């Protein structure tokens, strides 16, 4: 039989948590953007390797290849952005870009105390791309060019 | 194929980990693979064939391993660097052995045999202490 211990937070544990506290669970989310078969087991890995081998000649194996590649692309799709910005992780980082209130005026005492990440997310969906681009140019503009020039003697 | 250190103890091996530096492969191998990637056009025209299929799968696997290993270093706030530190007190519950014995007369691989049931937690405490907390503390300083 199997007995059980205790959290140790848990996957998506902060999903409904107030963002102020949920902000301290980032390790859990990040840990699992490449998984669902964690720990040796150690029969699960053996089985998966066995099916990855046996099924290499057929469509179902191909569909596993499809899924695996997808996972990797999604991962790197985020790592790319984190690399481009001066935010190599690090779970969090700050920019030089000033928050433009056009996006949202809401008070921080409302944000950090009574709102989930998803509620917050709904409100900034349409400004995501703009925000990214502004971070990007802020990263390059001066913070890298002038930086180079700050070592210019 | 950087396993030269396997014939030594952890002390000594620890002097050669930085000597290894140059990746275990990949890198220049990927540059050689670039030459092969050009060839892949021929191997495209080839059509679907066993070995070809295996190769595709082999590439996928290789890459998956690379990134999985790298991932944790990023999340840990250690990046790399081959040697980093983290503020996690070595809970003696895991092990209790003199450092002289841990580093000397201790094949690295052999050492792993006795750490395996604790490695999982150790990763957790690293995460949830080292980066979970410290990340905020820097921001918290920057708030003032």
């Amino acid at each position, epitope marked *: *039989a*199997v*007995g*059980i*211990g*205790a*959290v*140790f*937070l*848990g*996957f998506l*544990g902060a999903a409904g948590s107030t963002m102020g506290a949920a902000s301290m669970t980032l390790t859990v989310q990040a*840990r*699992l953007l490449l*998984s*669902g078969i*964690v*720990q040796q087991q150690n*029969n699960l890995l053996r089985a998966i390797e066995a099916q990855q081998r046996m099924l290499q000649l057929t469509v179902w194996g191909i569909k596993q290849l499809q899924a695996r590649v997808l996972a990797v692309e999604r991962y790197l799709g985020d790592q790319q952005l984190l690399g481009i910005w001066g935010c190599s992780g690090k779970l969090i980082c700050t920019t030089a870009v000033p928050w433009n209130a056009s996006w949202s005026n809401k008070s921080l005492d409302r944000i950090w105390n009574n709102m989930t990440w998803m509620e917050w997310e709904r409100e900034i969906d349409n400004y995501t791309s703009e925000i990214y681009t502004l971070i990007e140019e802020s990263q390059n503009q001066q913070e890298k060019n002038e930086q180079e020039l700050l070592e210019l003697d | 194929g950087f396993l030269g250190a396997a014939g030594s103890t952890m002390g000594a091996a620890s002097m050669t980990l930085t000597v290894q530096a140059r990746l275990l492969l990949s890198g220049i191998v990927q540059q050689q693979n670039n030459l092969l990637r050009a060839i892949e056009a021929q191997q495209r025209m080839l059509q679907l064939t066993v070995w070809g299929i295996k190769q595709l799968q082999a590439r996928v696997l290789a890459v998956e391993r690379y990134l999985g290993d790298q991932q944790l270093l990023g999340i840990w706030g250690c990046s790399g660097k081959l040697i980093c530190t983290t503020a996690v007190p070595w809970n003696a519950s895991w092990s209790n052995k003199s450092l002289d014995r841990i580093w000397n007369n201790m094949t690295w691989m052999e050492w792993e045999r006795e750490i395996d*049931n*604790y490695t*999982s*937690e150790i*990763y*957790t405490l690293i995460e949830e202490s080292q980066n979970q907390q410290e990340k905020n503390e820097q921001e918290l300083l920057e708030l003032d």
Partner: antibody
Amino acid sequence: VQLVESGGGVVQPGKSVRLSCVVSDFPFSKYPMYWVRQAPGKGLEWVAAISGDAWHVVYSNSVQGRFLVSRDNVKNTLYLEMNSLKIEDTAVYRCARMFQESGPPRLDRWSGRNYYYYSGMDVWGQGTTVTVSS
Amino acid sequence: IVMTQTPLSLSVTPGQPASISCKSSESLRQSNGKTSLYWYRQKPGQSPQLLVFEVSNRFSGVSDRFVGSGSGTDFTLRISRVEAEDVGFYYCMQSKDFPLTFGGGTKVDLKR
């Protein structure tokens, strides 16, 4: 290995006892332990189980809330306290050691919550009897 | 999750083959890729003696005359050349999940 029980006898319903077990010849803190129960002229009944690190513990429904089992990993002993005994608790009680020793609770990193592994048994003590009624 | 045994009692002569059947109402496969079912015996005044564990893996200090096997929901023992010493009560125990449970209990004895 040495596995003996101590502190049996007879009591009235509503009374309580502290039935202990003393062991030797092994790394006690690495072996989860069992308490088993056999009523006179009847078959076996599992009662309770306690993990090697003495953190995890489970009971049978019929005893849950009345029995309390503890450990002393320094002195190599078990302590099965039984409160508010009922007449039907009259039985042979016995201390036993798990066959396959478990390591530390395997933690899975996907909300694993530290799992403990439990297996069979390989050493039964002699046993003693606790009799209940006025 | 219960478990039953047959025969209730079994009378066999020294050198005679014999068997013990224990059926589970529930699947016995464990998450480690093996089943969780053990057998053992005790004589009057004696305590259970692990006979075999994990079905086919008989215990150290136990004769090869003791064998057994079965499906993912039930298992049986077979004892070849039953010895005069092989009398007493036999049980099976499911450890697949809590609470731990036992088979009905069988009594092996001699016939004359």
